[PDB]
Amino acid sequence: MLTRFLGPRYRQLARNWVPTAQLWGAVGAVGLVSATDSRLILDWVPTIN
Amino acid sequence: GRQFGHLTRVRHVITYSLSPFEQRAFPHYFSKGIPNVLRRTRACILRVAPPFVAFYLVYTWGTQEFEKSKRKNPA
Amino acid sequence: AEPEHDHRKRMGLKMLLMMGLLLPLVYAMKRHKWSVLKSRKLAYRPPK
Amino acid sequence: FVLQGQWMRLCTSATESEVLRGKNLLRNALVSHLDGTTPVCEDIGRSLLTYGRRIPLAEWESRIAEVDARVVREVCSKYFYDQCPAVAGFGPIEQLPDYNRIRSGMFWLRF
Amino acid sequence: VAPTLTARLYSLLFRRTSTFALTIVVGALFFERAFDQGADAIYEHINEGKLWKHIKHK
Amino acid sequence: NIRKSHPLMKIVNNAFIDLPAPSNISSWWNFGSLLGICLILQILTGLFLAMHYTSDTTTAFSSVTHICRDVNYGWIIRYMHANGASMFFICLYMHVGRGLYYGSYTFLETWNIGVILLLTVMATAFMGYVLPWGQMSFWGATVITNLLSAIPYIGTNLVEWIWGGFSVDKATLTRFFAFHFILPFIIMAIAMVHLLFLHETGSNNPTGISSDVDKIPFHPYYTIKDILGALLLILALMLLVLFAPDLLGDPDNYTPANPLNTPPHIKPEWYFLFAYAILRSIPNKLGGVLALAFSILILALIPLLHTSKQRSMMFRPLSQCLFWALVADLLTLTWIGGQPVEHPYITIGQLASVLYFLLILVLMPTAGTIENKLLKW
Amino acid sequence: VSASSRWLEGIRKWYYNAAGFNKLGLMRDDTIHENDDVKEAIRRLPENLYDDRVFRIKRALDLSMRQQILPKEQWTKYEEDKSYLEPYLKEVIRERKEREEWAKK
Ligand code: HEM
Ligand code: HEM
């Protein structure tokens, strides 16, 4: 159906993009947190209240 | 329209450039800079300045006559 | 008449401090990219 | 665009099979080139001027053998990733990209 | 300071667009906390309607 | 690759990325994006305003107060709209002026569409000001709308048709609201066509010479310079709205509407003051509105009176002076327009009006001819 | 020839200097507005002048960008100002005018 993407190279591809994809998601996370403040998701560390 | 590679025909003109990470964004900024603004001002005053002062004067005169008119001595 | 008076002027203080910090920075961003063009040299070498 | 596309791809996502192709292309280039008294002679003279030794094929083989994908994407990154290029153009170059754009293609926002 | 702060800022945090993005967002947080308060604070050189000052009297 | 081929990206690419642009454009070319910016800023704060405003006489003014006191941050939203309207006009005035000075008008279609864009925002803004239903909103709505009654045999009916009543009543406010909502979207489609015709030749530049010989891609260069440009727009706008919200509106338009009052004042907002001056300079109902109109549609005559062998004014001294006298004369006009029709003000307001038309219709083209002759052309 | 002619010639030299295309090393014909008659004249130029015309426009746009100007010695001097386009332009006009006469009969 849709799985020609299995194999040593594709596996290799995936691993080279892991440090990146993980790091990227963290960006967006911290991004969402800071965007709506520490109640609407993620409170904690040196910032008031 | 128009693109790049279909603009026009140019021949024998070399262009040296230097990468932005290797030069300063503000070289002689005050040094070369200010004299230039003075030179540009010189070149343009005689064409920009006069029309405006003509209004500047028309403005203050225009107001004085107005204000001074709503007053009067005899008759 | 103008309840917002205080806050208005508070944002204004922040607006002046920020603009006062963004303005130079955006300028240096711009001259940096325009520097390839401002510093640039031309020569004309036609056939003899 | 395509040229630069490959440098970054290699800087960031180089894969194992292609690296073997590279290694193999290089083993053939090396051996194929040292065929005949002339290229070999030239090789001895040059090497001693630059290496101070003559590097035996077995060593170059070992040096090639050690290269894997990780090396490729590490070594390419060091020289290619986000570095300023020296560009030189001649001919009908109206569409040669502006330096900044060439410069901006030396790194990538995905990565 | 020494083999350069910017150099390290580049090497450790600016070579990737990831870390770049990541620091900007982390740097966005603190900046807000520091400035929003900093500007509110500087504004306190008007010990007048200063709600806090009135809070004590009434 | 992807940018160049994809049906939507092409458009973006051809308009803001790979568009060949002269490496030469100066600050006076920034008003293009700035209007674009002003247009969006004015639709965005405009929509949020419509979420609390009501277009009925008995609550109209009250709803606007409701916004500034009760609606969170309603006040900034309100003043940003207010000031953005003037900011939109300063930019509009720079833009038209820029083109006049630089010969940009030689691009007829682009320019003509520009005139349609000028009229559309004027009609738009005029309706905007009536919405709060303030003293000036009503009387400015009265004074201005009534002009159409000078048109022979059709006029009375016309004014009564758009009014909805026999005055500026209930029908007029709701009416004016609806058109004030629909107009900026139409303006947008038209700005797209403005940009569509412009792309057919690319931009002009200060020399009026021709830049195929030295184009640079719109991207680093003019995206980043428009950014810095929008930033300065924001400064001017915010400096205006935070520190002096009522400066250009003048302390006046508060206190609700009263169809029996008639304030010894009556003057449209500042951006119509030059036109306003021209109108009252003429003793005559018909002639006044005829010359009122002509003072703006004359922009559609400019290309027919180019006359000079060079396109720009950069290399033409006499023309520069005449241009500056046009701008100088336009200050006088707004200044006069903002003053009562008494002793000094009538006659200069009269003289300046004749000059406006003498300058554009006779003096400027003549200078072009003289200029050609001095260069042996 | 005398006093008056030199006066008109001096007024012309004055205007020239004021017009300031000289300051950007431009020649008068480099500033001509490009309508069809002119577009064609440009086309008809020989290789040399065409190339020189492009370098000047380029030199000028460059200056115009960084809002600078050329040292006084390199300004083009009035009447050392070759009006290279004129004869082509004239001929192109003359050709159009002939087409136009034929279109009336
Ligand atoms: C479709 C987009 C727009 C919407 C939804 C909108 C909405 C509104 C509303 C609800 C009001 C009445 C509330 C108030 O007066 O603050 C208003 C007033 C006004 N509008 Fe707009 N508007 C739009 C576009 C524009 C445009 C493009 C301009 C031209 C610059 C403009 C100029 C004005 C002016 C001058 C006022 C009166 C100023 C004031 O009292 O604050 N509007 N608009
Ligand atoms: C909704 C209002 C308007 C918008 C959004 C708009 C948009 C633009 C934009 C984005 C440009 C790009 C070139 C530049 O940056 O200057 C431009 C150029 C131009 N516009 Fe407008 N414009 C508006 C009103 C006007 C009007 C009032 C005129 C004059 C009647 C006008 C006539 C022109 C002309 C002739 C050019 C060519 C300029 C040149 O190449 O030097 N536009 N306009």
- Amino acid letter for position F77: I
Would you call C5 an interface residue with chain B, using a CB distance cutoff of 8 Å? no
The amino acid occupying position F151 is I
Domain that holds residue B10: 1-75
For residues F349 and F277, is the Cβ–Cβ distance under 8 A? yes
Q: Is the CB of residue G59 less than 8 Å from the CB of residue G24? A: yes
Is the Cβ–Cβ distance between F147 and F275 less than 8 Å? no
Element (H, E) at B13: strand B13-16
F199 in Cβ contact with F32 (< 8 Å): no
Cβ-Cβ contacts under 8 Å, G39 against chain B = none
Collapse the DSSP code of F20 into the 3-class scheme (helix H, G, I; strand E, B; otherwise coil) and give the result.
Answer: strand
Q: In the PDB record, what is the listed experimental method? A: X-ray
CA separation for the pair G105, G103 (Å, rounded): 6
Report the distance separating Cα D67 and Cα E46, nearest Å. 68
The radius of gyration of chain A from alpha carbons, rounded to an integer in Å, stands at: 18
Work out whether strand F20-22 and strand F215-217 pair parallel, antiparallel, or are unpaired. antiparallel
Taking one residue from C and the other from F, the number of pairs with CB-CB distance under 8 angstroms is 48
CA dihedral F80, F86, F92, F95 (to 10 degrees): -90
Torsion sign, CA atoms F373, F375, G1, G7: positive
Task: Say which residue the tokens 């194992």 belong to.
Answer: D16
User: What phi and psi values does residue B20 have, to the nearest 5 degrees?
Assistant: -60, -20
Nearest CA in chain F to G28: F375
As a whole number of Å, the CA-based R_g of chain B is: 27
- Annotated active-site residue in F226, F267, F308, F371: F226
Ligand 1 proximity of F121 Cβ (cutoff 6 Å) = yes
Report whether F343 contacts B61 (CB < 8 A): no
Quick one: chain D helix, strand, coil %, rounded to 5?
A: 65, 0, 35
Known binding-site positions of F for heme b: 81, 95, 180, 194
Q: What is the CA radius of gyration of chain C?
A: 23
Q: What is the domain range of residue G3?
A: 1-105
Domain of B32, CATH number, reads 1.20.5.210
Cα–Cα dist F27/F206, whole Å? 10
Taking alpha carbons only, the member of C16, E35, E50 closest to residue F242 is: C16
G31: closest CA of chain F, how far (Å): 6
Four-point Cα dihedral F223, F227, F229, F231, nearest 10: 180
| Alpha-carbon distance values, F189 to F184, F186, F328, G46 (Å) | 9, 5, 34, 46
E11: left (phi over 0), alpha (psi -120 to 50) or beta: alpha
Best substitution site from F16, F39, F42, F95 to test ligand 2's pocket, by max atoms within 8 Å of Cβ? F95
Neighbour count for residue E48 (Cβ, 10 Å): 9
Using alpha carbons, select from D21, D99, D98 the residue that is nearest to residue D67: D21
Domains and CATH numbers, chain C: 4-48 (1.20.5.100)
F251 conformational bin, left if phi > 0, alpha if psi -120 to 50, beta if neither:
beta
Which three-class secondary structure state does DSSP give residue F168? coil
Resolution, angstroms, 1 dp: 2.6
Regarding the beta carbon of F218 and ligand 2, being less than 6 Å apart is answered: no
DSSP characters for E7-48?
HHIIIIIISSHHHHHHHHHHHHHHHHHHHHHHHHHHHTS-TT
Written in H, E and C, the secondary structure of G6-19 is: HHHHHHHHHHHHHH
Please tell me the distance from the alpha carbon of residue C17 to that of residue C14, in angstroms, as a whole number: 5
Look at the alpha carbons of F313, F315, F318, F321 in this order and tell me if their dihedral is positive or negative: positive
User: What are all long-range contacts of F346-354, with beta carbons under 8 Å and residues at least 24 apart?
Assistant: F346/F281, F348/B58, F348/B62, F349/F277, F349/F280, F349/F281, F350/F281, F350/F282, F352/F277, F352/F281, F353/F277, F353/F278, F353/F281, F353/F282, F353/F291
Query: What is the rounded distance in angstroms from the CA atom of residue F116 to the CA atom of residue F300?
Result: 10
Residue F49 CB–ligand 1 contact under 6 Å: yes
Q: How far is CA G42 from the centre of its chain?
A: 11
State how far the Cα of G27 lies from the Cα of F105, in Å rounded to an integer.
Answer: 24
The identity of residue F362, as a single letter, is V
Number of neighbouring beta carbons within 10 Å of residue G101:
8
User: Which pair of tokens denotes residue F317?
Assistant: 């001294």
CATH assignment at residue G83: 1.10.1090.10
Q: How many angstroms separate the CA atoms of F173 and F63, rounded? A: 14
Residues with Cβ within 8 Å of E47's Cβ and at least 6 positions away in sequence, in order, are E53
Terminal alpha carbon distance of chain A: 54
Write F198-203 long-range contacts (CB < 8 A, 24+).
F198/F107, F198/F110, F199/B1, F199/B2, F199/F14, F199/F15, F199/F19, F200/B1, F200/F109, F201/B2, F201/F107, F202/B2, F202/F19, F202/F20, F202/F21, F202/F22, F203/F21, F203/F22, F203/F25, F203/F29
Interface of chain F against chain G, CB under 8 Å? 22-24, 26, 103, 106, 205-211, 213-214, 308-311, 314-317, 371, 374-377
In this structure, are residues F117 and F190 in contact, taking their beta carbons and an 8 Å threshold?
Answer: yes
Assign domain E1-58 to its CATH superfamily: Cytochrome b-c1 complex subunit 9 (1.20.5.260)
Pairs of residues, one from chain B and one from chain C, whose beta carbons lie less than 8 Å apart: 44
Pair D13, D73: CB distance under 8 Å: yes
Q: Is F180 in the pocket of ligand 1 (CB under 6 A)?
A: yes
Residue type, B15: T
Helices E17-43 and C5-38, packing angle to 10 deg: 140
Whole-number Cα distances in Å, F42 to A48, D69, F129, G27:
36, 54, 13, 46
What residues are paired with F215 via a beta bridge? F22
* DSSP type of residue F256: B
A1-49: CATH class: mainly alpha
Burial F66-88 (b: 16+ CB within 10 A, else e): ebbeebeebbbbbbbbbbbbbbb
C33 touches D: beta carbon within 8 Å: yes
| CA atoms of F209 and G32, how far apart (whole Å) | 7
Who contacts F318 (Cβ-Cβ below 8 Å, separation ≥6)? F367, F370, F371
Whether F353 and F291 have beta carbons less than 8 Å apart is answered as: yes
Distance of CA D34 to the CA centre of its chain: 20
Residues of E in contact with C10 (CB under 8 A): 39-40, 43
D chain contacts of residue A22, beta-carbon cutoff 8 Å: none
Q: Write out chain A residues lying below 8 Å of D76, CB-based.
A: none
Residues in chain A, total: 49
- The chains found to touch F (3+ Cβ pairs under 8 angstroms) are B, C, D, G
Q: How far, in Å, CA of E24 to CA of E16, rounded?
A: 12
Bridge partners, residue B2, by sequence: none
- Chain G residue numbers with beta carbons less than 8 Å from the beta carbon of C42 are 55, 58-59, 62
**Which strand (E) or helix (H) includes residue C44?**
strand C41-44
Rounded to whole angstroms, the Cα distance separating D111 from E37 reads 35
Domains in chain F: how many in total? 1
By C-alpha distance, the chain D residue nearest E14 is D82
Instruction: Reply yes or no on whether F265 is catalytic.
Output: no
* Residue G87 to residues E56, F296, G80, G98, Cα–Cα distance (Å): 92, 41, 17, 17
Query: Which residue shows structure tokens 């665009």?
Result: D1
Report the amino acid identity of residue A2: L
Q: How far apart are CA G55 and CA G62, in angstroms?
A: 10
Token reading at F306 = 């180019």
| C12: Cβ contacts below 8 Å, ≥ 6 apart | F238, F242, F243
> Is F252 noted as a catalytic residue in this protein?
no
Identity of the residue numbered B12: H
- Per-residue buried b or exposed e for G30-59, using 16+ beta carbons within 10 Å of the residue's own CB: bbbbeeebbebbbeebeeebbbbbbbbbbb
CA dihedral F314, F315, F321, F323 (to 10 degrees): -50
Q: Which amino acid is at D50?
A: T
- Pair type for strands C41-44 and F20-22: unpaired
**Rounded-to-integer distance, Cα G29 and Cα G82, Å:** 8
Looking at the CA of residue F121, tell me the nearest atom of ligand 2: 1
DSSP code of residue F16: I
Ligand 1 atom at minimal distance to the Cα of residue F131: 12
Neighbours of F306 (CB within 10 A): 16
State the DSSP string of F138-153: HHHHHHHHGGGGGSTT
| Phi, psi of F20, rounded to the nearest 5 degrees | -65, 125
Residue among F134, F111, F101 at smallest CA distance from F315: F101
Domain boundaries, chain E: 1-58
- Tally of structural domains, chain B: 1
Q: Is F199 a catalytic residue?
A: yes
| Residue-wise burial string across C15-30, b where 16 or more C-beta atoms lie within 10 A, e elsewhere | bbeebeeeeeebeebb
Quote the domain boundaries for residue F351: 1-377
Rounded Cα distance between G46 and G52, Å, is: 10
Please list, residue by residue across B41-66, b when 16 or more beta carbons sit within 10 angstroms of its beta carbon and e when fewer do: eeeeeebbeebeeebeebbeebeeee
3 state DSSP class of C43: strand
Q: Which residue of G has its CA nearest to F23?
A: G65
CA distance G49 to chain C (A): 11
CATH code: domain of residue F61: 1.20.810.10
